[PDB]
Design a protein around this nucleic acid. Structure first.
Ligand SMILES: O=P(O)(O)O[C@H]1[C@H](OP(=O)(O)O)[C@@H](OP(=O)(O)O)[C@H](OP(=O)(O)O)[C@@H](OP(=O)(O)O)[C@H]1OP(=O)(O)O
Ligand SMILES: O=P(O)(O)O[C@H]1[C@H](OP(=O)(O)O)[C@@H](OP(=O)(O)O)[C@H](OP(=O)(O)O)[C@@H](OP(=O)(O)O)[C@H]1OP(=O)(O)O
Ligand SMILES: [Zn+2]
Ligand SMILES: [Zn+2]
Lengths: 454, 384
RNA sequence: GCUCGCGAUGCGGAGGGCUCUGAUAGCUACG
């Protein structure tokens, strides 16, 4: 027990009750202790657990760590140890994401903070804790239903939270480029530099770290969390709320006018999409035609972390990949849970994907099941708007800086196909997953990318 | 003594009570704290003397969503009558191993080789289910209280909610209908807070009334075994129970042979079991005949108080099944279907039982009564 | 006979807070 040992070691101790929240199931408590002058805190649905986590924090800092379930450890990053310690980094990103989300919901008061899954991207420029800047914040645990998909790319396909935070990341990255391609003094303010290998790369020691409030659906979550000691397949999401199911690598694919008869559009799980990001980067197709591939250095799970299954889900299950294009590589980022893991909350999921990016005034609330915003308007994150920002970029970029020949863009899918190298790394990932025996990525019909800014 | 239904009813109630008290220090053990008793007794001849208690259990609760095991070590449903059947399965494997011990011993087993292949029950042996109350789902929900004998009976038999398959629902009161909009749960989804669905006990007892009570693994050895009577200690409503046990699905057809729509005797006792005051215990005790003493499982974890798996979980029973399998000649098998030694698959080797299950499933679907709700199949894939 | 909507009175597994009793294991002070 933590409070037992903490109150025998420093018996002259007094804990403090800060605030509460929620009602019914939803109820969250923060308790803060101060032992030897140093302050600590912890969180849980009842007061005794919040105090227990504060006591655990005090113990692990001042004295030492308690007898720990070893799967709750952390795989270290690919090449280096350069942003403080893994658990301290992870706790930092948890607090930062929660902080900005509080700001965006008027300190968790606003009706849109009633979320089931929180995700965020944070950016680190260096070792100092002061170089931390929250890049985007997102919630949501649902997806567009088939009959609300737009052939014009004005409706959001996948509103799962971590996905929405990646798309917000993309907005931030495009704006970073808009900053670079203006007053030529603003280029030292940018996050980018001109790549010697042509195009654009990132300044030294600019790291993006991913935080999800839970283990991402799909393969990273298929375990019994109360008994550690197992196939790694691909899974599609399901039309009924949250959850995923395996694929069949040999049968029959779908259509695009098929949400009107029987055999619908499946959407890939979040663990599979995050392995995708760990091979082809996070910039995606169009943005690759501008910048060198970008990967995350860390992944932080606020709950349901397990080192073995997370590791399998993020990179291990595609060890067998080879023939990686230049600048590409299978990304083995930092995996780490947190200390005060969030607790399960039985009940249905929201129909809303709220999102936000640094520089934006307020959040944006999307109806997940329709893929458009609360007032029927297309998002700032759907395919069409991202194409439009990328077109703003293509206009300003000198053509000798491009990473491929796309100086005549008309439609979305063709501009996508203009990334030879990227789509090559894609094809390598797909054959790596098939030859691994795990499945054939469900390719969404091309007919929703057949739009232009026309 | 050739019985009227009451007689046999009051008898089996008496027996299961007495056995329970014997196991719990004459109802003085702290493990006698219960809201729902339920047992199974055997008869071998119409005389109050030669008929004995196979199992007894207690419990009102089901496993938490995040505690379910991919190794078949946790117990999901511990409503007393579900646990009582699982105890009966333990007794059935013991009786098989008694047959398989030697030929002098075969004489005392309740099975015999059967003409169709495999084993069958000896004539004049049969089983009786007792429950202190009515099973959740369709035989209770509409009147969870005693019938006021002034009050006749259900005055809206034809409401669409009569006979619907309903599921227990995690962190929530009551038994929810299915609607044939029966989108099966996922594993990752349940871990992330989607609530865990478990078919209601009247639904399971209808299922045991079409496919027997031995499940698929045991059916690979034994012609299907059905209850003969269902005795309720309280809340007995004849019309609701008769609907929810067999009558719902009297539209069922094309059952595999030896399977049928078993319509057992339903009876209430003479004088009801009285409401137990206090909080409902979160544990469930279980006892099979020929056991040193009770076992006590925490309902919300599906494991005992020290975290060790139960003599009743999927895994324990798969081990029992494997013990008998290794001793049953390939000629005495009721299915010579080879399937890999992993739990889900081994179940699949029971072709006839899976057929009769599918027939029951469409019987419920076609009656307008919704479609069954399987567990995330990720649960049933393991080995030893 | 039902169905759907809206009321109303009731019936049937989670979470949180407090109060009291008992036992356990440590911890002090005291004579
Ligand atoms: O972040 P997501 O919601 O998962 O969206 C992605 C993203 O689509 P957009 O960038 O057009 O919004 C991919 O873009 P790229 O990585 O290629 O840049 C696209 O990839 P494809 O070009 O392979 O189609 C993929 O589509 P798919 O599902 O076919 O892999 C699609 O996923 P969703 O359809 O789930 O939104
Ligand atoms: O009703 P229970 O006593 O809880 O056990 C049953 C039993 O599974 P086990 O005997 O392996 O524990 C069923 O299997 P059979 O005995 O009929 O072969 C299984 O059904 P399936 O075989 O159709 O999977 C069903 O679960 P479900 O129907 O939801 O999958 C499961 O009941 P629980 O789900 O409540 O454990
Ligand atoms: Zn997801
Ligand atoms: Zn029940």
């Amino acid at each position: 027990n933590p409070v037992m040992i903490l109150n025998e070691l420093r018996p002259g101790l007094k804990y403090d009750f800060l605030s509460e929240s929620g009602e019914s199931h939803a109820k969250s408590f923060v308790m803060s202790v101060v032992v030897d002058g140093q302050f600590f805190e912890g969180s849980g649905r009842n007061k005794k657990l919040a105090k227990a986590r504060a006591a655990q924090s005090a113990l692990a800092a001042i004295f030492n760590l308690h007898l720990d379930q070893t799967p709750s450890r952390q795989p270290i990053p690919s090449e280096g140890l350069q942003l403080h310690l893994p658990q301290v980094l992870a706790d930092a990103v948890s607090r930062l994401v929660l902080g900005k989300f509080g700001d965006l919901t008027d300190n968790f008061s606003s009706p849109h903070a009633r979320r089931k899954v929180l995700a965020g991207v944070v950016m680190t420029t260096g070792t100092d804790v002061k170089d931390a800047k929250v890049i985007s914040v997102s919630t949501g645990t649902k997806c567009i239903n088939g009959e609300y998909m737009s052939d014009r790319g004005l409706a959001l396909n996948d509103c799962h939270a971590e996905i929405i935070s990646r798309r917000s990341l993309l907005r931030f990255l495009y704006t970073q480029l808009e900053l670079y391609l203006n007053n030529k003094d603003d280029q030292k303010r940018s996050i980018f530099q001109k790549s010697e290998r042509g195009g654009f790369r990132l300044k030294e020691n600019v790291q993006f770290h991913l935080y999800i409030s839970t283990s991402p659906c799909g393969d990273a979550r298929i375990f019994s969390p109360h008994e550690p000691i197992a196939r790694g397949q691909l899974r599609t999401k399901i039309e009924s709320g949250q959850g995923t199911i395996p694929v069949r690598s040999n049968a029959s694919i779908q259509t695009w006018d098929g949400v009107l008869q029987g055999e619908r559009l499946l959407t890939m799980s979040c663990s599979d999409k995050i392995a995708r990001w760990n091979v082809v980067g996070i910039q995606g197709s169009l943005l690759s035609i501008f910048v060198e591939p970008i990967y995350f250095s860390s992944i932080i799970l606020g709950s349901l972390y397990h080192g073995d299954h997370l590791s399998r889900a993020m990179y291990q299950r595609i060890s067998n990949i080879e023939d990686l294009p230049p600048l590409y590589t299978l990304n083995k980022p930092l995996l780490s849970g947190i200390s005060n893991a969030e607790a399960r909350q039985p009940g249905k999921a929201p129909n809303f994907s709220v999102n936000w990016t640094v520089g934006d005034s307020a959040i944006e609330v999307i109806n997940a099941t329709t893929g458009k915003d609360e007032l029927g308007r297309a998002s700032r994150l759907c395919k069409h708007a991202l194409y439009c920002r990328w077109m703003r970029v293509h206009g300003k970029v000198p053509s000798h800086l491009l990473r491929s020949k796309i100086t005549k863009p008309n439609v979305y899918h063709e501009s996508k196909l203009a990334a030879k190298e990227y789509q090559a790394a894609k094809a390598r990932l797909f054959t790596a997953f098939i030859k691994a025996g795990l499945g054939a990525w469900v390719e969404k019909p091309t007919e929703q990318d057949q739009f232009s800014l026309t």
